[PDB]
Ligand binder design. Structure first.
Ligand code: MG
Ligand code: MG
Lengths: 238, 236
């Protein structure tokens, strides 16, 4: 079995579909509307927004394409990719971030890139013209750090985070390490937050939705993953 | 070679990912906000909204999952599936539609289901609690091109304040364009998304795929496989 072939349509959609681009504009448009609303409501502390990087601001789909072509999945040559620092900005992101900056709102890029990829990450953010592309605003993941809550909490110490942007539920508060059933129920419970405080972007290529199927164990063999993937489809029995 | 296998992750995301559900809530939440705003300002004609059905209101992913499991691509058992009228509603859809109806807004389900699938479609919509599940509000495909004619028809008597869909051709201005041109059209219309055009994620199938084939699905699995690979952009 070649697991990477199973990614192909998801990757192809993400890389080529205008629908994908439209969803990014929709997310950033909605985020801008909600940013204005939040500023008009006012805050107790200095306003901030938080964004994930990969598949929220920066497009890493060329790496996923590489995995399809080579048959070698993530993280094969992921660090090589990060070091090239050539991911493109996703639709709407830069203009939204420049708008945010124009309103005096601080931006925090909370990303699970490794802290030792900061230089490459700054390089890529400078290349795409993302504001506040500095160590003070780019909060990467420490080795052994679980999730992002620690960085969110740090930001919330000094800022009232009025919006979160991401492609993975764990880019928002309240969705860490849950089973498929539990994270899905959590979405239902927090349904009012989406498009309000949590601005979500589509990423069918990879993420916690997949990790959750493996109980977050990617050390599973390819054969194991293949069975899990098949077993979790809900098929029409004609 | 086993072309259906290439859909597996797209389907699995759509069927299982909480992120998918959140995107549906996001879209319908935004829809409600924008509907209220539109109603506050008033319209010249009676307000309406337009929704696509498949992968917008009704979830057909069990059919696509079946395709993967059996290795049998479209149209295998599609009509069977439609006839079973057992698709579930997509997250947020039904409460949004009920809200909409309560505001005196007419709903038009403009769908490229075939006009001979109307009874099944009504059945399925009734089953999930979609309001206005009647022939007057469900505008299915005439075998004699796209949905613009139906949209224009509704616009004669209603001011359509919102459009909902998973495929760009669910909105005006995206019919039969190349990948390059439909993508540029999205850029050109970027302000509309989340404002007048509410989009939902569907990586399983759609005009995004059709456009890669120049809308000619009379291709072998081997032909589609080559196109698909050639349109992935790797790095050096
Ligand atoms: Mg991400
Ligand atoms: Mg549809």
């Amino acid at each position: 079995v070649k697991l990477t072939d199973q990614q192909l349509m998801a990757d192809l959609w993400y890389q080529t579909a205008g629908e994908m681009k439209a969803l990014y504009y929709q997310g950033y448009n909605t985020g801008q509307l909600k940013l204005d609303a939040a500023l008009a409501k006012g805050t107790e502390k200095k306003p901030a927004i938080v964004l994930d990087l990969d598949e929220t601001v920066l497009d890493n789909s060329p790496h996923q394409a590489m995995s399809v072509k080579t048959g070698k999945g993530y993280p094969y040559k992921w660090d090589d990719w990060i070091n090239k620092a050539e991911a493109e900005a996703l639709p709407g992101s830069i203009d939204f971030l420049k708008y945010t900056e124009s309103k005096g709102v601080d931006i925090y890029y909370i990303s699970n890139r490794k802290t030792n990829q900061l230089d490459a990450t700054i390089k890529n953010l400078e290349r795409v013209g993302a504001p506040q592309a500095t160590k003070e605003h780019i909060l990467l993941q420490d080795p052994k750090e679980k999730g992002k809550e620690k960085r969110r909490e740090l930001v919330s110490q000094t800022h009232d985070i009025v919006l979160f942007f991401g492609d993975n539920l764990s880019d928002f508060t309240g969705f860490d390490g849950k089973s498929v059933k539990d994270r899905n129920q959590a979405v239902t419970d927090s349904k009012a937050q989406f498009g309000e405080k949590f601005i979500i972007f589509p990423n069918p290529m990879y993420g916690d939705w997949e990790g959750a199927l493996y109980d977050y164990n990617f050390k599973k063999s390819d054969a194991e993953k293949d069975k899990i993937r098949h077993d979790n489809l809900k098929s029409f029995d004609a």
